[PDB]
Symmetry: D2
Subunit: 297 residues, 4 copies
């Protein structure tokens, strides 16, 4: 029934050069994702530092993502969450009027809505557009969790809501979700446990690691979707070291560092309050990167 966006997906970093969005590098990075088997890209999400982007930069990165993926099978799942419902509705409509195929909408952060409030929050979002809406649960960042019951109720009550991106380190909850609502699309939000989530019936990943190693995250996901769990687990095991080191500090500090170390972006620039990693963690990321075959452009 439901319109879905699944498979291997990349939470795109937003490269900056002299405090401005590096627009051809942004486009150059997405084409690199397309050519390495990625099924969808997520502009202006957490890994893209949406929280510090201006309104316009937000529009520029969605429009570049939409245009770069034209004429390919690669979908654009635009970041559109906010802790204010009227703001999240505006972001959802914004992503729709600018050509996104669907939206990722993170649970409200900081203001800790109740489960009832989360239901009304997402119901208002789902009714505002006619494109797929993927919930994003990351309690370590938001201070709140969308309960299994709330996710399932939203999936059943609102046409557009087709699943949830899980970044809670709780494989029990992933069993809980798919055992009581097996029709939903559970999406891995934690690279280290990509395979365990997929092997339980998860239908995709929204990846940080795929920024650096899109081919490996792509192959992992597609192996698992084709039920080649031995080959999916083998990439997951090989990726564990980089999957962990990419969170030595808060994402996207390590991944942007690695992208810079790989020569895939020109400057190691963040928007405050994000900043360069410690020099110790800088060295750790560079060291761990050395075992992986990093595709160029």
């Amino acid at each position: 029934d439901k319109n879905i966006i699944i498979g291997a997906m990349t939470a795109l970093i937003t490269p900056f050069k002299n405090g401005k969005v590096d627009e051809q590098s942004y486009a150059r990075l997405i084409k690199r994702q397309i050519e390495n088997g990625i099924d969808a890209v997520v502009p202006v999400g957490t890994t893209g530092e949406s929280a510090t982007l201006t309104h316009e930069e937000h529009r520029t990165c969605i429009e570049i993502a939409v245009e770069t993926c034209k004429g390919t099978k690669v979908k654009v799942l635009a970041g559109a969450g906010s802790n204010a419902t009227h703001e999240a509705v505006g972001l959802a409509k914004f992503a729709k009027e600018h050509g996104a195929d669907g939206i990722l909408s993170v649970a409200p952060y900081y203001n800790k809505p109740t489960q009832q409030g989360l239901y009304e929050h997402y119901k208002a979002i789902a009714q505002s557009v006619d494109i797929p809406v993927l919930l994003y649960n990351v309690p370590g960042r938001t201070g709140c969790e969308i309960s299994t019951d709330t996710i399932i109720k939203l999936f059943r009550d609102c046409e557009n809501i087709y699943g949830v991106k899980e970044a809670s380190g709780n494989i029990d909850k992933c069993v809980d979700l798919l055992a009581h609502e097996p029709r939903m699309m559970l999406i891995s939000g934690e690279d280290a446990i990509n395979y365990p989530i997929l092997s339980n019936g998860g239908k995709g990943v929204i990846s940080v690691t795929s920024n650096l190693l899109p081919d490996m995250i792509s192959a992992l996901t597609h192996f698992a979707l084709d039920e080649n769990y031995k080959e999916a687990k083998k990439i997951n095991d090989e990726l564990y070291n980089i999957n962990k080191i990419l969170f030595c500090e808060s994402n996207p500090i390590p991944i942007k560092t690695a992208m810079y170390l790989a020569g895939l972006i020109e400057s190691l620039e963040f928007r405050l309050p994000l900043c360069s990693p410690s020099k110790e963690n800088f060295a750790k990321i560079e060291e761990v990167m050395k075992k992986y075959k990093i595709k160029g452009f």
Copy 2:
């Protein structure tokens, strides 16, 4: 250092037909003035800061500033953000609009490092010339301002004069005031108002004081005069309401209580915040019965 301390209220923002009830806002703030409160915090967490428009945000700061003119009560305006350039803009805004200082919560959701938190607050502190109070609430932000970072910011930036602590960590409050006794430690958790003050805390930014400003004001001023027996006795008496006011996420219970007390006209929130459950509504009403609530 210029400071803003004493008994302070995290002001609720009353809504009427989904729009800011400006007259009730002013009436609630003066009600605070008349009950011994030393400072008010407009457009903070308890004020549903996150969901207000730019104009509403301006309207409530301006009302607060205006209502406090001609009194000793200071306006400590909410100005935090998880984007440094946004927080700098909010800081400048509050300054330009007559606020006596700013409360600026640690960046939420994007989890900056300690180094990033330092640069975040340094940029905010250099952007204005009014006192800046840090706000640490890791349960809401996903982030913590370490003791070392707080102390470094206090020592390096003239405007940063202390921290509002909402971490349930009296150990950290000992850590803070034992290594930097000059800072102003402000209670951000009503239930442990007295323990924080008794260790050298110099004020509270209270949720409960919305409902019981006279008791929170007396508690704080007793404690500041080292009348610890009387401060602790008010803290002990207030425990039941202090807990029930977080039966659901603040400000859902306090707005419910303010509505039950007839102090605001509508039990209206801005989504994703909403009315409490029917059971918690009744629990709040039940606990309120043991307290004497001042009218207008």
Copy 3:
């Protein structure tokens, strides 16, 4: 390495009038063997090991050893303790009384360091010549056996062949098997039996199998045979019972369920364990109605 893997049951210890019901104990083990179980764990956490006398500990190990003679079912005896010299004595005891291997939980309460945990288990491993399975359950012990410590112990001590994981941390299970794929990772949490097995885990030590031995043994054997579809569907039906069996601290719900199913005569615990609340008693009864419980 000698290993003990597959579908395993953490045996409850039935009491009658404050005494170990030896007949029931043998009959329950009898029942597990007949439903495809590969090994039984006497005198573990689910068996209320902490409150058994020396005599009772001995009794239940010997009954387990006796009941599994002439079958393929191994006896993996509980032998952990937070005192190394006591754990060595328990390990030697289990070997002297016919156990095929030992489960040895990480020291509880005294929170040893990783270095101490390494020395603790090396002393245990050198004390016997039978396989040793580590048991990590930080929610109960207050300590964690780190991945590095587990891997070092697996490589440095012949008898140590894997770890029972009860940490709600599938990341650690990836960590373990990605860096030491030769070890035997055993599920200690029934609800996530399949995810652990599907990542290369080689068995479960189950609470649910006390009640539903046929379903837990089929799940494990399906997964071990790389029939992950059939393993996952049994894991999915078992979720409701897997969760309700921990509505209160194990083994309070499983003994309640065993009593409700008529598999044990009395709902008796040894203090400080006790009957569940009346609400949770009814909840366990309600969840059981969807399942087909095998009798004797």
Copy 4:
């Protein structure tokens, strides 16, 4: 109610060639007596209770009881267990051997329910006629004694006169004394000794007092006399050592410090406890240099 309050020391248990140094044990207790300590706690957590033999347990209680005869110092013997019948035996043991009261930690590892904790402690309290102090340390036991359970036990059983809290939860300490101000709240965390005392706590059971008994004793008695300025100044002064004494799991740092101060002859632990890392050894030595350490 009969109570045991004031400044109290959780005694380390010195070992020499794997055996309890009985002479050193007595000499250490006499040092505590001579430095203002009001009570000593033999065979507790800091004394490595979990790894002592029956004989050693009794030897250390008898040495403590004998050494404190003719002094104002009471013996609050460790007597907790996670098995109620074992804890009852330990309670009767301490009473029959001259202890003035017992400390009884919440059952560890097996996670009893609040109902089970109530029945656990009621049986212990009925078994003896000397004061019983509860010990809540959820980070070690995996369980918490709720405020309601503590208050119920205090009200229903004569011997239960308070609780030793090691939960880093000053909110709970407000909760306890706001609803039951007659109980004796005892600090189980040295860093927050003063905040607990200034809220109405009536004593400490201290790790730091092993090394600095005069300073912990002065802190407590200043606080008990409502000299909070002087009590807080010692608490602030002690923060660095109070923190470093848990760089690793207690009693690893305190025994290291006692050995570095020449107060015990060998840095020996019973496994799974062990010497600290070389880094933390040096850190402990560094922080110790800022303090005046009394000899014998």
